[PDB]
């Protein structure tokens, strides 16, 4: 983000410009050019989650939905299970656990908005209720993400 | 008599469906009957063809 | 119109529903009698050929 | 979004009360200000679209909640499908009449007409389960909200219990959105003015330096000078009748 | 023809509906928007009892 | 009308239940009312009861009404064309081609023995196909009279053109 802003407001000397352009390319190239399925599985497993350039893209999800299926979208289901787990165990509004929730909630909106079959999965696992609590749970990014998480679910139940 | 009437109308529709289904039930049965009533003609021809063999 | 008038038409409604269905149901069971005979003759002719 | 009308008032100077405040005495880093606005804006436009979407669903469902309830009573066959009912709102009992005429004359006598008052009129036609397509063409072409079940929450029996719980999910979801919207309106209302003023001066700064060649062939004399930090305030307060005096 | 049709409308129209019988003498014909329509195609007023008029 | 009849009369076809009654002057039998009461007793009432038709379903009934309506206008149209072609030819009478007794037998009288005429239409047949046969017949007739006239109008142009070539 800092580099991208810089690119518009360049400095008179040429060499300065070259450095801005070359650095911009490596950072951006590097994250997207890794496989989408790899990145998603790697974050969920280790339990450490953070937004990233291709981890927030609509495309990332679109490709990865089909792949999830092995026992009715088993991987997605594990994610909903992780969001559920964090809130109940160890409380909420502890630095670590709070980072994961916003990310977990960003991931679940995109998937749900994409496939209508996801609606059953929220209900079976019991994630649908957990989201309603998250509106009430403090911090602006958390209630923001919960509202987006809720609106995607609602749209398929009742049009 | 508004909801008493609707329920009669409702009953009217079930009676109509049952009337239609009854005719469909008839055919279903008639398909099993065709096999039953064909099984009796066949085994009477079978023992006659054996009779004229027992002669030869 | 008035509830009474709307109930005279209600009575007419369930009359229609019943009458077209009896009419349908007679045709439906008449195809079922043509089908019984015909299937019965077809089973028999096939079988006597085997026995032959 | 905020329901605020356009603010201009056209100030770069630091001398005035509003000058000092909506325009910093600090320098101008053009990147920093752009960034401040971009991120908030991304959340806001996403937010507004959501608000609108949520509001329309809640509103539809709230309206038809009562509709299906009334229709169930006019007796336990409107949770099922043993018969067909057409639930619908229409704004005029007058339009209800014209439909009744079309109906009687040309498709025979096959309607049960019941009505309930809404805040609209709740109309009820009831029909066969084989002639449903034909009722829709009539209803649609005079514009009625006559659908077989106006609620889309049909998926258990009683159907009204599902309607009630989506109306329960909707009503709170809506609440939260509104809460997010107000604080954010409050928060960037002040900033929006202060940034507007900032930007005017950025457009000028580029222009002073010359950002395209027409600016060069417009003023051929470009001079340099030093005004200390305090005096800088009074320098923009005056403007000459042709002078564009750079701040920081 | 007109006076005849009126004596019929008044005599028999009651069967069709209490509000649906209006006095008319001469064929009323409407075709303005979807607020006034008269035809067997589409209608929003018609004869309350079944009547066709044949003229050569 | 007063020139589009010369031995016809104008007709209203109505159907009522056999339970219908008049409220113009109560207490009267429907049959008695038509004769005595309806426009000063001048009314000539004739029977027109036609027997049953097979009817397959409730849905199909609706579709029948649609066909009856369009075809009936189409046939009305087709009579409009035929009469227009006779006038065009300069065939006008005081008792024909603008009234024309059906088969040279007065029009009220024809309707009185119209108790479902048979010309290839049968009262034990299915309703739908009969509607189609009647409409097909008329349409073919309509094409025939139109096609023949077209050739008549064209032929007249050749004679006219040719008359100037021989003297003009």
């Amino acid at each position: 983000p800092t580099v991208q802003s810089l690119s518009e407001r360049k400095y008179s000397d040429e060499e300065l410009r070259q450095d801005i352009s070359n650095l911009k390319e490596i950072l951006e190239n590097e994250y997207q050019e890794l496989t989408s399925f790899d990145e998603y599985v790697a974050e969920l497993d280790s339990k450490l989650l953070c937004w990233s350039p291709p981890h927030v893209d609509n495309g990332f999800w679109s490709d990865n939905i089909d792949e999830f299926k092995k026992d009715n979208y088993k991987i997605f289901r594990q994610l909903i299970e992780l969001l559920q787990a964090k809130v109940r165990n160890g409380d909420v509004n502890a630095k670590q656990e709070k980072i994961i929730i916003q990310v977990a909630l960003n991931d679940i909106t995109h998937v749900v908005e994409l496939l209508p079959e996801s609606i059953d999965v929220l209900d079976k696992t019991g994630g649908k209720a957990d989201i309603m609590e998250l509106l009430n749970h403090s911090d602006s990014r958390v209630k923001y993400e919960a509202l987006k998480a809720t609106q995607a679910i609602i749209g398929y139940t009742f049009k | 008599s508004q909801k008493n009437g609707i329920a009669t109308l409702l009953q009217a529709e079930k009676e109509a469906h049952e009337i239609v289904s009854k005719a469909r039930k008839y055919r279903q049965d008639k398909l099993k009957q065709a096999k039953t009533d064909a099984a009796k003609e066949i085994d009477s021809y079978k023992i006659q063809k054996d009779k004229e063999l027992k002669e030869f | 119109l008035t509830p009474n008038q709307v109930n005279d038409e209600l009575n007419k409604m369930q009359a229609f529903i019943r009458k077209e269905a009896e009419e349908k149901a007679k045709e439906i069971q008449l195809k079922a009698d043509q089908e019984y005979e015909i299937e019965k003759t077809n089973i028999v002719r096939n079988e006597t050929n085997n026995i032959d | 979004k905020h329901d605020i009308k356009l603010y201009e008032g056209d100030t770069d100077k630091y001398l005035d009360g509003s000058g000092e405040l909506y325009v910093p005495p600090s320098g101008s880093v053009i990147d920093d200000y752009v960034r401040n606005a971009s991120y908030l804006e991304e959340r806001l436009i996403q937010m507004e679209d959501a608000t609108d979407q949520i509001e329309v669903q809640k509103n539809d469902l709230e309206q038809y909640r009562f509709i299906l309830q009334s229709g169930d009573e006019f007796i336990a066959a409107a949770i099922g499908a043993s018969v067909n009912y057409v639930t619908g709102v229409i704004a005029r009992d007058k339009v209800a009449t014209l439909e009744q005429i079309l109906w009687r004359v040309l498709r025979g006598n096959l309607f049960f007409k019941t009505v309930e008052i809404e805040q609209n009129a709740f109309i009820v036609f009831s029909h066969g389960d084989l002639i449903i397509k034909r009722i829709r063409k009539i209803a649609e072409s005079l514009d009625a909200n006559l659908y077989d079940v106006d609620s889309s929450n049909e998926g258990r029996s009683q159907q009204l219990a599902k309607v009630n719980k989506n109306l329960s999910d909707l009503y709170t979801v809506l609440k939260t959105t509104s809460t997010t919207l107000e604080s954010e309106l409050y928060a960037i209302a002040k900033e929006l003015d202060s940034w507007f003023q900032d930007v005017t001066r950025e457009k000028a700064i580029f222009e002073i330096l010359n950002k395209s060649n027409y600016d060069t062939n417009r003023k051929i004399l470009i001079a340099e000078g030093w005004i200390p930090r305090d005096e800088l305030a009074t320098l923009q307060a005056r403007l000459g009748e042709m002078i564009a005096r750079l701040g920081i | 023809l007109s006076k005849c049709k009126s004596e019929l409308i008044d005599a028999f129209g009651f069967l069709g509906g209490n509000a649906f019988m209006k006095d008319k003498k001469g064929k009323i014909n409407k075709q303005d928007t979807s607020l006034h329509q008269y035809a067997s195609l589409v209608d929003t007023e018609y004869e309350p009892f079944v009547m066709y008029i044949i003229n050569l | 009308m007063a020139t589009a009849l010369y031995t016809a009369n104008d007709f209203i076809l109505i159907s009522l239940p056999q339970n219908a009654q008049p409220v113009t002057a109560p207490g009267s039998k429907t049959d008695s009312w038509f004769n005595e009461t309806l426009i000063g007793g001048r009314a000539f009432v004739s029977d027109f009861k036609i027997p049953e038709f097979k009817i397959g379903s409730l849905d199909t009934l609706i579709v029948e009404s649609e066909e009856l309506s369009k075809v009936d206008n189409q046939i009305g149209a087709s009579i409009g064309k035929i009469i227009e072609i006779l006038q065009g030819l300069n065939e006008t009478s005081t008792n024909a081609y603008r009234t024309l007794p059906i088969n040279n037998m007065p029009v009220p009288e024809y309707l009185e023995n119209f108790q479902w005429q048979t010309r290839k239409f049968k009262l034990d047949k299915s309703i739908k196909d009969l509607i189609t046969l009647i409409s097909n017949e008329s349409s073919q007739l309509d094409a025939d009279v139109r096609a023949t006239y077209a050739n008549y109008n064209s032929a007249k142009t050749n004679l006219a053109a040719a008359e100037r070539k021989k003297t003009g």
Side-chain angles (χ1 to χ4, degrees), chain B residues 14-32:
Chain B
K14 282 153 170 183
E15 181 172 286
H17 182 56
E18 185 62 45
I19 285 183
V20 177
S21 284
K22 168 180 76 67
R24 287 184 292 113
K25 173 189 57 65
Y26 292 153
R27 191 157 172 123
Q28 201 185 95
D29 290 75
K30 302 275 202 286
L31 189 75
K32 294 195 282 314

mmCIF file of all heavy atoms in Angstrom, chain B residues 14-32:
data_model
loop_
_atom_site.group_PDB
_atom_site.id
_atom_site.type_symbol
_atom_site.label_atom_id
_atom_site.label_comp_id
_atom_site.label_asym_id
_atom_site.label_seq_id
_atom_site.Cartn_x
_atom_site.Cartn_y
_atom_site.Cartn_z
ATOM 1 N N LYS B 14 -59.884 -32.691 -2.446
ATOM 2 C CA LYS B 14 -59.318 -34.017 -2.122
ATOM 3 C C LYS B 14 -60.113 -35.130 -2.763
ATOM 4 O O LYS B 14 -59.537 -36.158 -3.059
ATOM 5 C CB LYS B 14 -59.314 -34.216 -0.583
ATOM 6 C CG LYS B 14 -58.150 -33.433 0.002
ATOM 7 C CD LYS B 14 -58.602 -33.101 1.492
ATOM 8 C CE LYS B 14 -57.398 -32.521 2.293
ATOM 9 N NZ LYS B 14 -57.668 -32.225 3.759
ATOM 10 N N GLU B 15 -61.482 -34.981 -2.819
ATOM 11 C CA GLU B 15 -62.408 -36.007 -3.299
ATOM 12 C C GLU B 15 -62.142 -36.149 -4.759
ATOM 13 O O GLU B 15 -61.888 -37.230 -5.226
ATOM 14 C CB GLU B 15 -63.937 -35.660 -3.161
ATOM 15 C CG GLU B 15 -64.737 -36.949 -3.715
ATOM 16 C CD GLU B 15 -66.286 -36.788 -3.424
ATOM 17 O OE1 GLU B 15 -66.644 -36.944 -2.231
ATOM 18 O OE2 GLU B 15 -66.990 -36.299 -4.321
ATOM 19 N N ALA B 16 -61.948 -35.065 -5.528
ATOM 20 C CA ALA B 16 -61.527 -35.056 -6.895
ATOM 21 C C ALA B 16 -60.223 -35.708 -7.239
ATOM 22 O O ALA B 16 -60.057 -36.389 -8.210
ATOM 23 C CB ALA B 16 -61.489 -33.648 -7.485
ATOM 24 N N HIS B 17 -59.196 -35.448 -6.373
ATOM 25 C CA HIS B 17 -57.908 -36.137 -6.491
ATOM 26 C C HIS B 17 -57.966 -37.623 -6.266
ATOM 27 O O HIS B 17 -57.233 -38.294 -6.923
ATOM 28 C CB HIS B 17 -56.812 -35.400 -5.557
ATOM 29 C CG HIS B 17 -55.402 -35.976 -5.620
ATOM 30 N ND1 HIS B 17 -54.648 -36.139 -6.754
ATOM 31 C CD2 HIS B 17 -54.790 -36.590 -4.595
ATOM 32 C CE1 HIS B 17 -53.604 -36.875 -6.290
ATOM 33 N NE2 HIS B 17 -53.592 -37.147 -4.982
ATOM 34 N N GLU B 18 -58.868 -38.077 -5.285
ATOM 35 C CA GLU B 18 -59.061 -39.425 -4.898
ATOM 36 C C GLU B 18 -59.770 -40.154 -5.955
ATOM 37 O O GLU B 18 -59.428 -41.330 -6.199
ATOM 38 C CB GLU B 18 -59.878 -39.404 -3.623
ATOM 39 C CG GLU B 18 -60.172 -40.748 -2.863
ATOM 40 C CD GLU B 18 -58.856 -41.430 -2.376
ATOM 41 O OE1 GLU B 18 -57.994 -40.663 -1.823
ATOM 42 O OE2 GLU B 18 -58.694 -42.681 -2.488
ATOM 43 N N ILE B 19 -60.765 -39.530 -6.596
ATOM 44 C CA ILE B 19 -61.460 -40.020 -7.773
ATOM 45 C C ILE B 19 -60.558 -40.294 -8.982
ATOM 46 O O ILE B 19 -60.600 -41.310 -9.692
ATOM 47 C CB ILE B 19 -62.637 -39.084 -8.099
ATOM 48 C CG1 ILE B 19 -63.864 -39.257 -7.113
ATOM 49 C CG2 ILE B 19 -63.099 -39.390 -9.539
ATOM 50 C CD1 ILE B 19 -65.019 -38.383 -7.523
ATOM 51 N N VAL B 20 -59.609 -39.351 -9.252
ATOM 52 C CA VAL B 20 -58.609 -39.513 -10.233
ATOM 53 C C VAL B 20 -57.544 -40.649 -9.935
ATOM 54 O O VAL B 20 -57.164 -41.453 -10.784
ATOM 55 C CB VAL B 20 -57.992 -38.212 -10.627
ATOM 56 C CG1 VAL B 20 -56.845 -38.462 -11.660
ATOM 57 C CG2 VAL B 20 -59.057 -37.268 -11.225
ATOM 58 N N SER B 21 -57.079 -40.670 -8.696
ATOM 59 C CA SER B 21 -56.166 -41.635 -8.225
ATOM 60 C C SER B 21 -56.785 -43.033 -8.223
ATOM 61 O O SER B 21 -56.049 -43.995 -8.306
ATOM 62 C CB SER B 21 -55.760 -41.404 -6.728
ATOM 63 O OG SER B 21 -54.815 -40.315 -6.622
ATOM 64 N N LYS B 22 -58.097 -43.179 -8.015
ATOM 65 C CA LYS B 22 -58.775 -44.420 -7.960
ATOM 66 C C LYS B 22 -58.723 -45.077 -9.358
ATOM 67 O O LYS B 22 -58.580 -46.275 -9.511
ATOM 68 C CB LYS B 22 -60.246 -44.150 -7.743
ATOM 69 C CG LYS B 22 -61.159 -45.385 -7.938
ATOM 70 C CD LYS B 22 -62.622 -44.906 -7.670
ATOM 71 C CE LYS B 22 -63.306 -44.092 -8.736
ATOM 72 N NZ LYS B 22 -63.550 -44.869 -9.891
ATOM 73 N N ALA B 23 -58.869 -44.232 -10.396
ATOM 74 C CA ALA B 23 -58.796 -44.734 -11.737
ATOM 75 C C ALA B 23 -57.365 -45.152 -12.085
ATOM 76 O O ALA B 23 -57.220 -46.141 -12.853
ATOM 77 C CB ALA B 23 -59.295 -43.588 -12.584
ATOM 78 N N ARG B 24 -56.378 -44.489 -11.553
ATOM 79 C CA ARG B 24 -55.013 -44.839 -11.739
ATOM 80 C C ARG B 24 -54.611 -46.068 -11.028
ATOM 81 O O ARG B 24 -53.767 -46.790 -11.530
ATOM 82 C CB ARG B 24 -54.058 -43.721 -11.410
ATOM 83 C CG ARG B 24 -54.115 -42.643 -12.492
ATOM 84 C CD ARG B 24 -53.102 -41.480 -12.328
ATOM 85 N NE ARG B 24 -53.407 -40.618 -11.157
ATOM 86 C CZ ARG B 24 -52.654 -40.489 -10.042
ATOM 87 N NH1 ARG B 24 -51.584 -41.299 -9.824
ATOM 88 N NH2 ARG B 24 -52.863 -39.335 -9.299
ATOM 89 N N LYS B 25 -55.196 -46.280 -9.848
ATOM 90 C CA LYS B 25 -55.114 -47.545 -9.039
ATOM 91 C C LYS B 25 -55.684 -48.708 -9.685
ATOM 92 O O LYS B 25 -55.243 -49.877 -9.580
ATOM 93 C CB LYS B 25 -55.589 -47.348 -7.587
ATOM 94 C CG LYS B 25 -55.727 -48.570 -6.656
ATOM 95 C CD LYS B 25 -56.409 -48.279 -5.295
ATOM 96 C CE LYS B 25 -57.742 -47.691 -5.456
ATOM 97 N NZ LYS B 25 -58.585 -48.734 -6.103
ATOM 98 N N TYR B 26 -56.741 -48.494 -10.471
ATOM 99 C CA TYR B 26 -57.348 -49.529 -11.272
ATOM 100 C C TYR B 26 -56.419 -50.080 -12.296
ATOM 101 O O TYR B 26 -56.276 -51.325 -12.417
ATOM 102 C CB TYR B 26 -58.610 -49.232 -12.113
ATOM 103 C CG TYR B 26 -59.818 -48.965 -11.287
ATOM 104 C CD1 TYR B 26 -60.818 -48.142 -11.848
ATOM 105 C CD2 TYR B 26 -60.045 -49.552 -10.029
ATOM 106 C CE1 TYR B 26 -62.023 -47.846 -11.107
ATOM 107 C CE2 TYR B 26 -61.222 -49.418 -9.394
ATOM 108 C CZ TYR B 26 -62.231 -48.558 -9.895
ATOM 109 O OH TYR B 26 -63.559 -48.696 -9.300
ATOM 110 N N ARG B 27 -55.752 -49.224 -13.058
ATOM 111 C CA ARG B 27 -54.823 -49.659 -14.090
ATOM 112 C C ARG B 27 -53.695 -50.423 -13.541
ATOM 113 O O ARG B 27 -53.274 -51.453 -14.086
ATOM 114 C CB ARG B 27 -54.243 -48.414 -14.810
ATOM 115 C CG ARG B 27 -53.449 -48.805 -16.093
ATOM 116 C CD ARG B 27 -53.390 -47.638 -17.058
ATOM 117 N NE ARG B 27 -52.471 -47.873 -18.227
ATOM 118 C CZ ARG B 27 -52.800 -47.810 -19.550
ATOM 119 N NH1 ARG B 27 -53.998 -47.391 -19.958
ATOM 120 N NH2 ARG B 27 -51.811 -48.123 -20.429
ATOM 121 N N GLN B 28 -53.073 -49.981 -12.424
ATOM 122 C CA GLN B 28 -51.986 -50.608 -11.721
ATOM 123 C C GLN B 28 -52.211 -52.102 -11.358
ATOM 124 O O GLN B 28 -51.397 -52.948 -11.645
ATOM 125 C CB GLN B 28 -51.764 -49.748 -10.419
ATOM 126 C CG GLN B 28 -50.365 -49.909 -9.802
ATOM 127 C CD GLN B 28 -50.346 -49.134 -8.497
ATOM 128 O OE1 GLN B 28 -50.586 -49.754 -7.433
ATOM 129 N NE2 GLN B 28 -50.107 -47.811 -8.571
ATOM 130 N N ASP B 29 -53.402 -52.377 -10.803
ATOM 131 C CA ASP B 29 -53.972 -53.614 -10.478
ATOM 132 C C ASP B 29 -54.265 -54.500 -11.646
ATOM 133 O O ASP B 29 -54.002 -55.673 -11.643
ATOM 134 C CB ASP B 29 -55.235 -53.505 -9.512
ATOM 135 C CG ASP B 29 -54.879 -53.053 -8.043
ATOM 136 O OD1 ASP B 29 -54.597 -51.835 -7.811
ATOM 137 O OD2 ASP B 29 -54.907 -53.933 -7.130
ATOM 138 N N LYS B 30 -54.846 -53.822 -12.705
ATOM 139 C CA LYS B 30 -55.094 -54.469 -13.993
ATOM 140 C C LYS B 30 -53.869 -54.929 -14.655
ATOM 141 O O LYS B 30 -53.884 -55.980 -15.294
ATOM 142 C CB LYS B 30 -55.941 -53.629 -14.953
ATOM 143 C CG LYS B 30 -57.362 -53.247 -14.348
ATOM 144 C CD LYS B 30 -58.481 -54.208 -14.490
ATOM 145 C CE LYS B 30 -59.873 -53.564 -14.374
ATOM 146 N NZ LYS B 30 -60.124 -53.233 -12.955
ATOM 147 N N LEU B 31 -52.675 -54.315 -14.449
ATOM 148 C CA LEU B 31 -51.347 -54.710 -14.934
ATOM 149 C C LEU B 31 -50.901 -55.956 -14.219
ATOM 150 O O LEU B 31 -50.434 -56.871 -14.966
ATOM 151 C CB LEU B 31 -50.278 -53.588 -14.769
ATOM 152 C CG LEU B 31 -48.944 -53.796 -15.405
ATOM 153 C CD1 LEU B 31 -48.976 -53.619 -16.880
ATOM 154 C CD2 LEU B 31 -47.930 -52.807 -14.898
ATOM 155 N N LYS B 32 -51.149 -56.075 -12.908
ATOM 156 C CA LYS B 32 -50.851 -57.334 -12.174
ATOM 157 C C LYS B 32 -51.810 -58.446 -12.520
ATOM 158 O O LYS B 32 -51.418 -59.601 -12.666
ATOM 159 C CB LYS B 32 -50.857 -57.065 -10.617
ATOM 160 C CG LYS B 32 -49.751 -56.147 -10.126
ATOM 161 C CD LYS B 32 -49.576 -56.201 -8.614
ATOM 162 C CE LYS B 32 -50.635 -55.403 -7.789
ATOM 163 N NZ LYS B 32 -50.842 -54.064 -8.365
#
